[PDB]
Amino acid sequence: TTTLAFRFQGGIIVAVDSRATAGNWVASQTVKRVIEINPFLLGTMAGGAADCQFWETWLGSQCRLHELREKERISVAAASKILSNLVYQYKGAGLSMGTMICGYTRKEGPTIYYVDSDGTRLKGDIFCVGSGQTFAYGVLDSNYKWDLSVEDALYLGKRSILAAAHRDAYSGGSVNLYHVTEDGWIYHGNHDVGELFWKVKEEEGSFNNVIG
Amino acid sequence: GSRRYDSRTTIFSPEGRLYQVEYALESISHAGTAIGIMASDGIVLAAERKVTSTLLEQDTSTEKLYKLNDKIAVAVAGLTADAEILINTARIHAQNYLKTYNEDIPVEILVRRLSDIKQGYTQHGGLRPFGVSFIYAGYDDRYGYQLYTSNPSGNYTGWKAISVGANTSAAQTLLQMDYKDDMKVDDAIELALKTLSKTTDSSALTYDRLEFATIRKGANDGEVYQKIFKPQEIKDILVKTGITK
Amino acid sequence: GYDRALSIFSPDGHIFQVEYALEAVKRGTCAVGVKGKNCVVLGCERRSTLKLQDTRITPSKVSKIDSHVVLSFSGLNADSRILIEKARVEAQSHRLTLEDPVTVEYLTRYVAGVQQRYTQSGGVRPFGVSTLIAGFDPRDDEPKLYQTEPSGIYSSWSAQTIGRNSKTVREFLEKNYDRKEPPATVEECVKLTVRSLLEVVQTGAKNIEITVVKPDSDIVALSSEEINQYVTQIEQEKQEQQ
Amino acid sequence: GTGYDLSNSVFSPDGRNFQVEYAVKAVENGTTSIGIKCNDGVVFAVEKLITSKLLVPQKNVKIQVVDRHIGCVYSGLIPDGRHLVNRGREEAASFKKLYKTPIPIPAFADRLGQYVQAHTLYNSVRPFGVSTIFGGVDKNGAHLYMLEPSGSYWGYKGAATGKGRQSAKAELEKLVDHHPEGLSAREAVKQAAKIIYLAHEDNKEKDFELEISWCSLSETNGLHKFVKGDLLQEAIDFAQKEING
Amino acid sequence: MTDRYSFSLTTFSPSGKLGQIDYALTAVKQGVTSLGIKATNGVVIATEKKSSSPLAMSETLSKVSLLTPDIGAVYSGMGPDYRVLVDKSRKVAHTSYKRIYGEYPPTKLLVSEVAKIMQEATQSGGVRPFGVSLLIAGHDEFNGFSLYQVDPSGSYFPWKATAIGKGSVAAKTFLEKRWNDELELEDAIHIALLTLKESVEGEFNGDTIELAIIGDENPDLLGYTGIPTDKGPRFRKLTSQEINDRLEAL
Amino acid sequence: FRNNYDGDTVTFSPTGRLFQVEYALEAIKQGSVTVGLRSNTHAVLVALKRNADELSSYQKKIIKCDEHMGLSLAGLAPDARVLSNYLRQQCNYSSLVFNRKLAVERAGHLLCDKAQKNTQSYGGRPYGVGLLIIGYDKSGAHLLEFQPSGNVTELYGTAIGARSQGAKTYLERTLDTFIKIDGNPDELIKAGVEAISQSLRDESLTVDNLSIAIVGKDTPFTIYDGEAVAKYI
Amino acid sequence: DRGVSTFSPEGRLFQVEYSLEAIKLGSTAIGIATKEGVVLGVEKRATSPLLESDSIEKIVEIDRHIGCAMSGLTADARSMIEHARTAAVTHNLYYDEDINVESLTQSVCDLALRFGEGASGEERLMSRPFGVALLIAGHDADDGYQLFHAEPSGTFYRYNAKAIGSGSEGAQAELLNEWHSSLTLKEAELLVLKILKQVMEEKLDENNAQLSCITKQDGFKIYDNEKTAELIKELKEKEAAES
Amino acid sequence: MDIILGIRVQDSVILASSKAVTRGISVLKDSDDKTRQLSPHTLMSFAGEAGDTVQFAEYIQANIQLYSIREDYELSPQAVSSFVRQELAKSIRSRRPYQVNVLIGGYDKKKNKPELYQIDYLGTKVELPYGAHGYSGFYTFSLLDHHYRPDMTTEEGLDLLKLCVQELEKRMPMDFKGVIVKIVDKDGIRQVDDFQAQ
Secondary structure (H helix, E strand, O other): OOOOEEEEEEEEEEEEEEEEEEEOEEOOOOOOOOEEEEEEEEEEEOOOHHHHHHHHHHHHHHHHHHHHHHOOOOHHHOOOHHHHHHHHHHOOOOOOEEEEEEEOOOOOOOEEEEEEEOOOOOEEEEEEEOOOOHHHHHHHHHOOOOOOOOOHHHHHHHHHHHHHHHHHHOOOOOEEEEEOOEEEEEEEEEHHHHHHHHHHHHHHHOOOOOOO | OOOOOOOOOEOOOOOOOOEEHHHHHHHHOOOOOOEEEEEEEHHHHHHHEOOOOOOOOOOOOOOOOEEEEOOEEEEEEEEHHHHHHHHHHHHHHHHHHHHHOOOOOHHHHHHHHHHHHHHHHHHOOOOOOOOOEEEEEEEEEEEEEEEEEEEEOOOEEOEEEEOOOOOHHHHHHHHHHHOOOOOOOHHHHHHHHHHHHHOOOOOOHHHHHHHEEEEEEOOHHHHHEEEEEEEEHHHHHHOOOOOOO | OOOOOOOOOOOOEEEHHHHHHHHHHHHHHHHEEOOOOEEEEEEEEEEOOOOOOOOOOOOOOOEEEOOOOEEEEEEEEHHHHHHHHHHHHHHHHEEEEEEEEOOHHHHHHHHHHHHHHHHHHOOOOOOOOHHHHHHHHOOOOOEEEEEEEOOOEEEOOOEEOOOOOOHHHHHHHHHHHOOOOOOHHHHHHHHHHHHHHHHHHHOOOEEEEEEEEOOOOOOEOOOHHHHHHHHHHHHHHHHHOO | OOOOOOOOOOOOOOOOOOHHHHHHHHHOOOOOOOEEEEOOOOOOOOEEEEEEOOOOOOOOOOOOOOOEOEEEEEOHHHHHHHHHHHHHHHHHHHHHHHOOOOOOOOOOOOOOOHHHHHHHHHOOOOOOEEEEEEEEEEEEEEEEEOOOOOOOOEEEEEEEOOOOOOHHHHHHHHHHHHHOOOOHHHHHHHHHHHHHHHHHHOOOEEEEEEEEEEEEEOOOOOOOEEOOHHHHHHHHHHHHOOOOO | OOOOOOOOOOOOOOOOOHHHHHHHHHHHHOOOOOEEEEOOHHHEEEEOOOOOOOOOOOOOOOOOEEEOEEEEEEEOHHHHHEEEHHHHHHHHHHOOOOOOOOOOOOOHHHHHHHHHHHHHHHHOOOOOOEEEEEEEOOOOOOOEEEEEEEOOOOOOEEEEEEEEEEEOHHHHHHHHHOOOOOOOOHHHHHHHHHHHHHHHHOOOOOOHHHEEEEEOOOOOOOOOOOOOOOOOEEEEOOHHHHEEEEEEOO | OOHHOOOOOOOOOOOOHHHHHHHHHHOOOOOOOOEEEEEEEEEEEEEEEEOOOOOEEEOOEEEEEEOEEEEEEEEEEHHHHHHHHHHHHHHHHHHHHOOOOOOOHHHHHHHHHHHHHHOOOOOOOOOOOOEEEEEEOOOOOEEEEEEHHEEEEEEOOEEEOOOOOOOOOOOHHHHHHHHOOOHHHHHHHHHHHHHHHHHOEEEEEEEEOOOEEEEEEOOOOOOOOOEHHHHHH | OOOOOEOOOOOHHHHHHHHHHHHHHHOOEEEEEEOOEEEEOOOOOOOOHHHHHHHOOOOOEEEEOEEEEEOOOOOHHHHHHHHHEEEEEEHHHHHOOOOOOHHHHHHHOOOOOOOOEEEOEEEOOEEEOOOOOEEEEEEOOOOOOEEEOOOOOOOEEEEEEEEOOOOOHHHHHHHHHOOOOOOOOHHHHHHHHHHHHOOOHHHHHHHHOEEEEEEHHHEEEOHHHHHHHHHHHHHHHOOOOOO | OOOOEEEEOOOEEEEEEEEEEEEEEEEEEOOOOOOEEEEEOEEEEEEEEEHHHHHHHHHHHHHHHHHHHHHOOEEEEEEHHHHHHHHHHHHOOOOOOEEEEEEEEEEEEOOEEEEEEEEEOOOOEOOOOOOEOOHHHHHHHHHHHOOOOOOHHHHHHHHHHHHHHHHHHHHHOOOOOEEEEEEEEEEEEEEEEEOOOO
């Protein structure tokens, strides 16, 4: 499972894999990997299934409550910290969570917080979480450029995922792409790896500079 | 029934303050006097001892003068019983502050805990308030000398000379007049001893019918050295002023 | 016992405890807040005829809740301290959990809930103090002034007065300040506040204490000396009709 | 209106609070129940009043079991009776689990008894106001006990209560005196029916439904049973015989 | 059940009075004559222990209790009130000084504890004070010999010599003259006997009088019949025979 | 006098009724009238829904509590709510734990204890509500009358709410006819609408806001509302 | 004074009745339910020319399709409003769907009885019940648009119109004639204000009224002040042309 | 660990805190302030787990800031330290200890002297001119005792710290990518945005 999210001029690019397995045989090419808390917050699945599921709907209750009662737009800054503080209470209770708390509010701009079961909350432009993460990081890093267009940003994201898909076998059923904007998230379709592999291997010429 | 055997008197009067609290104030004004004088090279405390006789032990005059700290002491006006409960809690509060922040309690900080409990006593339970007023004598290294007072109403103020217990009006009137800010310990004592005389009507006033303490800079400290006088030391100073009364 | 009938309605619909609470306020000191539109001025009376005390051992009229949130009161001293302690715990808890320097309104919601709380439910008796909570919310040039009561209500208010001589200061705010068009100068806002509390204190500038709060933590309390120069000026305006 | 009628957080000048006295008075204007001790058992009977044809015969029952071999009927205030029994059950079960035996009647009596006494030493907890005729057989014989409002209980050999008490007690003592204690359990059923029928003569502006039960060592084989079928028809026959019919 | 009397049952008035206390102070006066002398050469306590029926024994009645091996107490007032407060007084003396600090309590600090209980049962609603006044006499190297009274008020004071119960004013007076700074324990036993003689006659014999002393003691009962670690406790209470014998030489 | 046996739950009378019981009995009458009748195979409740404001909309006031149980109220609605709340909880706990389906008598007894604990403290209270509970178990059909006074009798017929006595007198007469008629619904339902119309004497009868509720051997718990009461007027 | 177990002859505590009197002394709130919308109007009330608008609460959101109007004391309704938000939030967590108008109402009113040191599986600990009634409106998929009147006495009635206030007399009688099964959302707002100006003794303006409605078009929408004034100005023409 | 150094010059406390987190081959994050400002003349720097750090930090800042307003003055470095240690000593007994070991670099602004404190995750308190965490000190105590002796201006402290960091990156196998330097004095907290020989 390999998930990445990077901050750029147009908002946020969030790109994720999907894969469910019975053996090494791909049982379903399908499963969520963005838990859509509400349209303004995303939390991405890379932790325990139940842990992520339980606390992230519960996080949806604290956001909904804050805005209903206090009549104030809740920050990403507030969303991560509510989460981190409860996490430390359920620490050494058997918790496994690796999520990135994504939002793009009026008052902060695009903001991506990495939040783990250790309770750590870090702000960064670039966070990759997984276990094909080091390889996925490579593709992204060598072609990184903050000033970029949303379309070209999507193609770089999806090639990065592919790179990680090919080597690591815990990704690569399908890719789901989402671009997270101010007014909410826009889905950029579901792309099959079979068709996507042959184009990239020829096209990119990274690790493929003499075709292999 | 017994839901109507409730006194219902720890609720407000229309006078802007609880029944029991206002009535309790009267009780104070019918028990011993404490006088607090804050000087420019000490703090002088005088209290007139309520019952003095041979049947009592006359060599004891710590019956209302307790030091809460190394540099904070209080004077009681009210009844022994009422006092003791706040004394013990102020002592601990001193130790909690000391332990947490590595520094001694400031005089107002200490005052403020005691006063929030006094209010509390009527605010939770319905129980009766205290019957004690303190005049606090202390030093802090942020304002110089501080001399304060609290009452069972939970209102507190700072003053440069005040009296509480019986004969507040008479003593306060005289104090405001002779007050200076170039007085020394010894000039204050003389002053104190005059005031006490003018509020007590006697042939003579004796040294064992007084409880006295002053908190001066000292000459064994750059701090403040707390001197608790006992009858025989009261006898000496009475000669020194040449004020026999 | 004491968990019941401290507070109940009459058939006339008055509450006993609330009705005797409002009476402690009229008796006590005087506090007023006048808002500019880029300042908020809080003027306070502290009234003592007995002169044998200092200001530096008598508690201040304006207490800091935060550097950019201030609290003023009229009423019992004892009760007000209880309320002040909650507001500081609520400032720091908010900062911790939502990771935003405080919004002044939320803090009103906490102090007001407590005040509601001891009235509605027994095992505690109500408060006898009314408060003014004022400050600036971050990223605002617009002043905030609130009033909260022992009832536990609150609302936001352009100038407001409580305590002794509420009528007089009220008339003055009605005829000399507008909700529509207030002072736009800091100076004129100071002038107005002094004018209002001077008519009622029945002393000079040595028993009016002015504190001016300009945006986000900028607080300066003008001294007796500074107020006197406006006090002079005021006797001159009044001798155009005398 | 003395606090000896609004509270039981004191002792009275009459050694009992007025409200407990009043419980005793309300048992007597009530419904009739008896209890007949015999040399091998006990028999219970109660008068169930008929006020309408809207009531169903024996689908409302007043004699309720505790355990399986102790039968309880009571006269007086209905709610208080439910609560007493519910308690009676919790004791009985606790005893069976804990000691691995059905509970003795002097034991069972001390357990209910202490609980009736408890509700009579608090100023806001309602007294009981039922008199309970109860009993059964255990491993050293049959026992008939009667429990009162006030927490008073003794063993009985014959017991009577209610509206028709006077009449009931008259017939009942005659028969008990005549007999070694009550003769056979079987004979006692008929006799029991006569008393209840005889007591009904004291209230003919209502009808009755005769209800009997028994608990007998060798004539129920240790169990408490309702008295029905033939055995109920026979007791009726005997009753209508003597009281003319 | 609880929660019906949660208002205090002392309240103030503009005369400042606390109802319960004034009534309870009266009770102390109506007790039997008990006295305390500090002779500044020990401490001597005496009281009357007296029948209340012809077939009541008095050798099953004591008014002298040990609070700890070396602090003793005497009282006037209500019998029950004294036993129950004494249990609680015992409790704190034993658990909080002999385990925590490993030694017997200092008197004055024990005076603070006993006061605090009495003042507490007045401050808390639903209950009353104790209707007794105790005289707590003890000895320590650090403080010398000491004597305090603790009132029903929960106020305290020290008293060179005092008396409470019936014939209070006269008993204290006669005593004050006969009290010297430097006074011999035998003479101080006579003065006590003499006083109690003035309160009662026609039932005054020495075997109905119970006298206890702080000073002389018996090591042989403190498990130091053999070689001592130390001398140990200074309170030792007389038997009747010792009392009667001295009464003859009164 | 008044103040001796009013609010005071700990007191008694030589008669055993306090003021708080007599007011409670009056409170039942100030709710709307509801009548009960049963055979031995069915139990029926006929209840009038009459609004208490001009604009008010009709809502159910017969509440199904379980598959084999329900109640209708007459008296105070908050008081009615708490009891219904405890009874639904009680119904569940018996079914999970003992698989036990309640008979009316058993619930009743439970109900008496609950009121009883609240009449042993000043901070609780007695109620102000009567209830007619119907249920069909394996001992046939049942109708129970629950009273705040703790008097529980299981009856063939009754009425509670205002003007009880119209219906009681009719119900005691048609008694003999109705109890021997088994396996036939329609006659017992029709007879209930006639009974309740003798309770009324000056108050309307509504031909689409009557609500009849039935339980039985061949009937699981159905409330007929609106249209479906027509053919029994 | 008065016990928490001391009834009137009718079964009803002193304290319960007494709350209900204070309700009627509050401000006027009027709600009309059709099957095209529920319109809620209240008088907001300006207590002085220096009291700021929309700092006093009279139109509150329980949820994004659910509103309430209050009458009585404003702080006393706050404990209710809190409980109502909490009930709404929780039901949505558990069941991922909307609370019904009825359900929501019941949950608040169970905890508005209480009072005294009693308990029976219900925790009661208040000194008084609340001094406030609220008209709770919502729309739910099943029953559509509904209006419910909550009494703080633990009593609840289903309604198609109700008015409360000190202006209750005029407004309920007017409401009966005005009521119909459906009529347009714009006609309804205009008509509400008409009824309000009648029971109001003074000139009706937007600095003492706030309007609100509930739509299936876009959920709970407070109909704001600027937009409301322009309707009051039309009101002056239509009303002085029937005269 | 997280390499955390300190040096106390005659007027100031200079504290050096790693600027990177390195995950195999590449630096995953490389913008890392591993220190949190308590107050304008109280700073505390940290090493331990990543999560303990921020959770303790925020809890502690909030408490101190509450004390600052209630008592109406800025709490001493001495007041903070005794507070910090006492909380850490309790946590060890409990299921979850806060496992952050700290350096508190302060200006005592009331008597005008800089103070540096090393307080361990257990509660082991020391005042030091210079100190270090872990295996760092084997190599860098050998350069600091030898080449430095007290009463040396601030710039000399910068050059020494860089020499210490270079030797660490060379010879010890841990990898932490230099230091980001912060100076605590009466003028507050300033960033040294150079680390090139400073």
